[PDB]
């Protein structure tokens, strides 16, 4: 055991002096020859209701036009967020959930919670109306999120310390993430659909490879535990939200920090975050019941987005980059361009 | 998916008739209902459209006062009550079905129809041709007209082609004007300008043969075309 | 333990050994995918209002 | 108006599923709903018998209400993440045992207090009153014959008797309460022979509705 | 100095009409408060909103200019003022009652379903009745100041006086007495902040309604008007600016919606 220790400390000084070996120069340094965006104002163009608990997650879908939300009245609705009309009205088994997702070619959504199971539901039938095709049962505490990769491919993450990745049309899982200690908190896929990133309560991300499962690269910095987590635009960087009230964006090749997002008046966590196709902004929610929009690559400026009675829970923005949605704890959801 | 049909056969002068429709194997509740018809040996011609939770009803310009529809959801059965009846009224009736939001398919099911025998700003769609002779192995192009545009503001464009062959009652091939069936072959396709429209088939088989119609949706009534011919 | 102190030790071994360069070089990648596609977001660069879908 | 027939169709079937969402959301909100919670060989098997993976969720009725009761044990995780959730919820029913006032796991009941006092004074249930189950009296009266309660109380001065010794451990679980003001808390002796806990449960409830009604109306 | 008079006068009217038509906008603007306690609040406010839009205009020139008016504007007015303030004591008494069905048997008040046509049918009741108790013996009037003729004899102003005033009085006082009972079996402190506030809404309504009935009917017995008749005529109408600030300002859905505006 002492020998063993020894050496994984040695291997961690290693690590860290890779990583401070090649810190040359800083965005701060060398972002200064851009011009700022100005004031940003944006205004609610469309508002969405019919809900009547709190709201905990929503997901666009990829014509830009069709989207699904759920709340903890047992319910899962799709939205016509043009003429804000109702689709599809679902009804649920268990109504203490926390996540849902829709599926890229339009033809699946998938759900779950405090149960243990992930749900997945067929939309197209013949007979008009919507019901389960599959139920996926296997861990042991919560779920937290669930994405998926095509019409036969989803990626779970639990409370257990794990993710998995299963595979729809047998039921049984395929390949096993292990290796975090605390709860698994959020998950985000990857553009080219190869791997993908978690975030911990234990303060930690890891990436990970979807077809042989081994964690290649770790990253720390956070002072408490991590709550939400997206990809870069191009795919090559990610930024996290805690709940010290600090964001922080990090880049894949370079194996450590780049820079951060926190201001002196703000006290209070981070619940959900976004970015936009040219990456130039990003939208993170609050508990202070309103989002912020921050500048990416200089991190002195923002935007604010009021409106909400409650604690902005979740947010999204479209393929095609033309609108943005956020759903709070007091049952509407609102639509901003 | 099964829609079956009562209520036919041979009436005198005057009289009335009541015509029965049984649904099995679906969600019933969910979709507006339509009657149409068709002349012994002429086209098809739009009845009467009721619609989801019996809220709207639409009749025929000929109809108005003589014809009923309505609906019952807890036994799934679809009524046609008609009264003083007259030789023109000579002809078989199919009940067929639609669904309305967001993407969906409607007039994808039809029924199999039943005999009945007794003893304007509305828009023209034209039939251009009437019968065309063709071999196996080619390909051939249909063409209709309107008298209206078609396209609207939403982009929308609501021309529909069906089929029929002989002996049978038809089933959709193409609806809002270029979008495809479900279950059809991928060698179908249509396409078309304001007031004028062509479909086209490539490779043609056996039992591609039977007469082809196209309707409009854009607003009531439902106008039919001639119907043409192809064998 | 001693299987759980191996498991550490390999995982970090293998972490170790990862290509690493210039994070400058990163910091140049940002600024040009940031630049060359600002001319198509919406967010940044109001789109006429008669061609928006949202009024 | 300037749309077509189908978005006609569309627009109604939207007003169907409107009327139907809010027909559920009246139903869905006449049950009382009630959290359990106690700890480890805390006898709350007897609680749920008696009263008529992942969360457990119960349904009965008594006097026509329709309560729901959910038992949440089997999560193995942190609190934090996961007790915001039961906000609005109407009361808490709180297990522990008597019998169990000087074992080792340091103390059964000190750390029973302890979890007490976590959840009596949390900031997502600052309005919601609490129930309170005594369980197995019995053994207890069988046990106290033999050893003293200063083995856990060194400071209580008083008999070796029964309802001495009850009284003082109800007083020390009635202390912790820092919302006197707020929210109440009820107390019984769980008995183990017929259905007096669900009238007990009954009337407690029927109090907290009273009293939330006579809040609502800023009398 | 009928200038000062006249303007604290429409003063007091434009208080009122503001006063209720902001419980007309919350009841409107927001869709959460389709409670029985919100439609007998709103039924209040329309009641009481139209008393400083009318009476008090029309009568504001009727006795400081000028009396080119006539019977055919006489009796209209009289029978307006009449009704308005006759309904606006029965919503006080129908709040009251629900709001003693609300704790004396909570049970069975939770899990009752009614939500639109017996409610307006009972607010069509409160109109029917206010107007019934009025209109027949008002319009009947034959030897008819602008004023009833059946002041010739004081006994239909006792029998109208008692079945207008005597009752409500009654029925609130006996109900709220009942909400302390039910209550009390920092525990004082509670209980007198109940007596404290039931005694201030019993108060408020019987010191407002009382002195101008009473007056009249003494009056009229033998001396078939000082000041003192005014300041009571006045009286009767101040308790129109109260009502908003007592019933809808203390319940708190209300304020929340408030709040949101
Ligand atoms: N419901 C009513 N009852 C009070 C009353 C009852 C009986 C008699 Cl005899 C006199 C007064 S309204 C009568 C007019 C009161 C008023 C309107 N404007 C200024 N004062």
Not at chain 1, 83 to 104: D, E, F, G, Q
Not at chain 4, 23 to 45: M, T, Y
Not at chain 4, 135 to 158: Q, R, V
Request: net charge neutral; charged share 20%.
């Amino acid at each position: 055991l002492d020998q063993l220790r020894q050496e994984a400390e040695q291997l961690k000084n290693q690590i860290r002096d890779a990583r401070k070996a090649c810190a040359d120069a800083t965005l701060s340094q060398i972002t200064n020859n851009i011009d700022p965006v100005g004031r940003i104002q944006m205004r609610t163009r469309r508002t969405l209701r019919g809900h009547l608990a709190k709201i905990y997650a929503m997901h666009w879908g990829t014509d830009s036009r069709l989207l699904v939300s759920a709340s903890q009245d047992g319910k899962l609705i799709i939205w016509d967020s043009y003429t804000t009309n109702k689709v599809h009205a679902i009804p649920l088994r268990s109504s203490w959930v926390m996540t849902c997702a829709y599926a890229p070619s339009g033809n699946y959504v998938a759900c779950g919670g405090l149960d243990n199971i992930c749900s997945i539901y067929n939309l197209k039938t013949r007979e008009g109306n919507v019901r389960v095709s599959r139920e996926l049962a296997g861990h042991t505490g919560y779920l937290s999120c669930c994405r998926f990769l095509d019409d036969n491919q989803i990626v779970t993450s639990s409370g257990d310390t794990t993710c998995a990745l299963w595979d729809i049309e047998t039921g049984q899982q395929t390949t096993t993430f292990t290796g975090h200690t605390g709860d698994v908190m959020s998950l985000s896929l990857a553009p080219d659909t190869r791997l993908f990133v978690s975030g911990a309560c234990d303060a930690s991300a890891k990436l990970w490879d979807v077809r042989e499962g081994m964690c290649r690269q770790t990253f720390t910095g956070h002072e408490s535990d991590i709550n939400a987590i997206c990809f870069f635009p191009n795919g090559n960087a990610f930024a996290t939200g805690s709940d010290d009230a600090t964001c922080r964006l990090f880049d894949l090749r370079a194996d450590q920090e780049l820079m951060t997002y926190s201001h002196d008046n703000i006290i209070c966590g981070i619940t959900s975050v976004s970015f936009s196709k040219s990456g130039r902004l990003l939208l993170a929610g609050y508990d202070d019941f309103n989002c912020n929009v921050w500048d990416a690559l200089k991190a002195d400026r923002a935007g604010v987005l009021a409106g909400h009675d409650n604690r902005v829970s979740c947010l999204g923005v479209t393929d095609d980059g033309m609108a943005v949605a956020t759903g709070s704890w007091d049952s509407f959801l609102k639509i901003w361009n | 998916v099964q829609l079956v049909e009562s209520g036919g056969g041979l009436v005198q002068p005057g009289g009335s008739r009541k015509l029965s429709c049984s649904a099995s194997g679906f969600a019933f509740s969910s979709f507006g209902m339509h009657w149409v018809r068709q002349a012994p040996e002429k086209g098809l011609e739009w009845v009467a459209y009721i619609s989801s939770g019996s809220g709207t009803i639409y009749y025929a310009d000929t109809v108005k006062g003589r014809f009923t529809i309505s609906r019952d959801d807890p036994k799934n059965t679809l009524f046609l009550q008609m009264t003083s009846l007259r030789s023109e009224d000579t002809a078989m009736y199919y009940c067929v079905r639609s669904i309305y939001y967001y993407g969906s398919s409607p007039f994808d099911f039809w029924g199999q129809g039943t005999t009945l025998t007794v003893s304007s700003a509305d828009i023209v769609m034209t039939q251009a041709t009437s019968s065309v002779p063709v071999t196996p192995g080619e390909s051939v192009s249909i063409s209709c007209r309107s008298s209206k545009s078609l396209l609207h503001s939403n982009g929308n464009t609501y021309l529909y082609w069906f089929l029929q062959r002989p002996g049978q009652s038809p089933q959709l091939l193409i609806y809002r004007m270029s979008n495809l069936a479900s279950g059809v072959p991928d060698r179908f396709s249509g396409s078309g300008s304001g007031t004028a429209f062509t479909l086209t088939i490539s490779r043609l088989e056996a039992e591609d043969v039977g007469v082809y119609y196209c309707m409009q949706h854009l607003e009531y009534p439902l106008t039919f075309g001639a119907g043409t011919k192809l064998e | 333990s001693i299987a759980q102190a191996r498991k550490l030790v390999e995982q970090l071994k293998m972490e170790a050994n990862i290509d690493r360069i210039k994070v400058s070089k990163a910091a140049a990648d940002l600024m040009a995918y940031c630049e060359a596609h600002a001319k198509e977001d919406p967010l940044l660069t109001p789109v006429p209002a008669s061609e928006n879908p949202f009024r | 108006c300037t749309l077509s027939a189908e978005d006609k169709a569309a627009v109604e079937r939207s007003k169907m599923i409107d009327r139907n969402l809010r027909e559920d959301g009246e139903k869905a909100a006449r049950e009382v709903k009630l959290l359990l919670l106690g700890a480890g060989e805390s006898g709350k098997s007897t609680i749920v018998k008696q009263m008529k993976t992942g969360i457990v969720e119960t349904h009965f009725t008594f006097k026509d209400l329709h309560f729901k009761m959910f038992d949440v044990g089997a999560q193995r995780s942190e609190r934090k993440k996961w007790i915001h959730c039961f906000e609005g919820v109407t009361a808490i029913i709180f297990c522990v045992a008597l019998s169990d006032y000087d074992l080792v796991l340091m103390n059964r009941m000190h750390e029973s207090m302890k979890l007490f006092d976590s959840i009596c004074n949390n900031k997502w249930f600052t309005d919601t009153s609490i129930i309170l189950f005594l369980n197995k009296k019995d053994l207890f009266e069988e046990k106290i014959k033999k050893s003293p309660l200063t083995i856990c109380y060194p400071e209580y001065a008083g008999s070796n008797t029964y309802e001495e010794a009850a009284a003082y451990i109800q007083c020390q679980f009635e202390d912790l309460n820092k919302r006197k003001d707020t929210k109440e808390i009820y107390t019984h002796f769980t008995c183990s022979t017929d259905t007096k806990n669900v009238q007990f449960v009954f009337d407690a409830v029927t109090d907290v509705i009273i009293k939330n009604n006579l809040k609502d109306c800023g009398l | 100095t009928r200038v000062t008079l006249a303007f604290f006068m429409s003063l007091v009217a434009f208080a009122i009409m503001l006063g209720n038509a902001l419980v007309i906008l919350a009841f409107v603007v927001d869709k959460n408060l389709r409670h029985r306690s919100s439609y007998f609040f709103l039924n209040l406010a329309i009641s009481d909103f139209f008393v400083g839009v009318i009476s008090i205009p029309l009568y504001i020139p009727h006795t400081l200019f000028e009396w080119d008016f006539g019977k055919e504007i006489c009796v209209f007015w009289l029978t307006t003022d009449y009704l308005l303030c006759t309904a606006s004591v029965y919503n006080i008494v129908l709040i009251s009652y629900d709001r003693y069905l609300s704790v004396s048997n909570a049970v069975s008040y939770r899990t009752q379903h009614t939500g639109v046509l017996k409610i307006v049918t009972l607010m069509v009741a409160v109109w029917v009745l206010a107007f019934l108790v009025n209109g027949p013996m008002i319009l009947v009037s034959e030897s008819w100041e602008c004023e009833p003729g059946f002041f010739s004899e004081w006994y239909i102003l006792a029998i109208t006086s008692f079945l207008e005033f005597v009752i409500p009085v009654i029925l609130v006082a006996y109900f709220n007495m009942n909400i302390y009972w039910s209550l009390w079996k920092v525990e004082l402190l509670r209980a007198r902040r109940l007596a404290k506030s039931l005694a201030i809404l019993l108060g408020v309504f019987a010191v407002c309604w009382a002195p101008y009935s009473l007056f009249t009917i003494v009056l009229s017995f033998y001396s078939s008007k000082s000041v003192w008749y005014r300041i009571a005529f006045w009286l009767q109408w101040f308790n129109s600016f109260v009502n908003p600030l007592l019933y809808p300002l203390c319940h708190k859905r209300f304020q929340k919606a408030f709040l949101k505006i």
